[PDB]
Design a protein around this ligand. Structure first.
Ligand code: COA
Ligand code: COA
Ligand code: CL
Ligand code: CL
Ligand code: CL
Lengths: 124, 122
């Protein structure tokens, strides 16, 4: 299942959920377009932040985002399908670090991010 | 200077000058995650929007190329956020914007740096 793990601010469909590795997909719709015709930076960032929270949960912990760095490599356009992949690269006592990639249907990398998460407790 | 950008998270304009834009907003429930905090993407979007405004204030259209953000203190229901964006580098091809988010108690809530890639004259 894994619906209801987090509050959904930007819609996505769950693809796979495993320890330290979560994959979801979404489609770029009108709501996310800026006036330049691109998926806005905050939309792409939120998809990555959401998945970083899911990845922390997948390691067995609640955590808050402490710091994040994101690169926008290629624009997302109306109708694009985005595959968002989050992988834990450091599963620490106090911090988790998550690498996130966002890829389109042409397998071009749209964005990449690193999230540093501060652990607040053991899950459920 | 409303009208400059598409608004994804609401804000009220406080001041708009060349290289320096300030806006304000209130944290409402729709932005709260299950931990009761304004979610990271909501804060980031406020910062990304003001970085767009700052780039426009310098005379240029730009797209976000890279951004780093630190979440220093959580935003809570009812908090008033002051978002201040300052161009620290007004370059030919890139603009760099230093963004600070503070609360009513004057505590620093978040700090971000946006690297904007210039696409043309506004
Ligand atoms: C920053 C850092 C300490 C975060 O720790 P973490 O995410 O909890 O990761 P770990 O679980 O692997 O713990 C690393 C060490 O920090 C300690 N630590 C973790 N959380 C701690 C906390 N809350 N308070 C005190 N120590 C803590 C652990 O006990 C562990 O100590 P050990 O070496 O005796 O086993 C860790 O990522 C790190 O050591 N990074 C390298 C920092 C570095 O070398 N910087 C450049 C040179 S200064
Ligand atoms: C990265 C950087 C080049 C971006 O350029 P910018 O935002 O356009 O900034 P500026 O307008 O001040 O231009 C800086 C230089 O880059 C050149 N430049 C700007 N845009 C360019 C472009 N599109 N293509 C080729 N050159 C360009 C300018 O001509 C200027 O060179 P000049 O000293 O001969 O006049 C600039 O911020 C910089 O020089 N940063 C320092 C990089 C550094 O020292 N890194 C560590 C050591 S390698
Ligand atoms: Cl690419
Ligand atoms: Cl826009
Ligand atoms: Cl406040």
């Amino acid at each position: 299942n894994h619906l209801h793990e987090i509050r959904v601010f930007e819609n996505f469909d769950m693809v796979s959920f495993e320890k330290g590795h979560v994959i979801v997909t979404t489609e770029v719709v009108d709501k996310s377009l800026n006036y330049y015709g691109f998926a806005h930076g905050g939309y792409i960032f939120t998809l990555c932040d959401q998945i970083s929270g899911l990845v922390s949960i997948s390691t067995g912990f609640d955590a808050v985002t402490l710091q994040s760095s994101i690169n926008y490599l290629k624009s997302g356009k109306l109708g694009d399908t985005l595959l968002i992949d989050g992988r834990c690269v450091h599963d620490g006592r106090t911090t988790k670090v998550v690498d996130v990639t966002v890829t389109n249907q042409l397998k071009q990398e749209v964005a990449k991010a690193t999230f540093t998460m501060f652990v607040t407790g053991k899950r459920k």
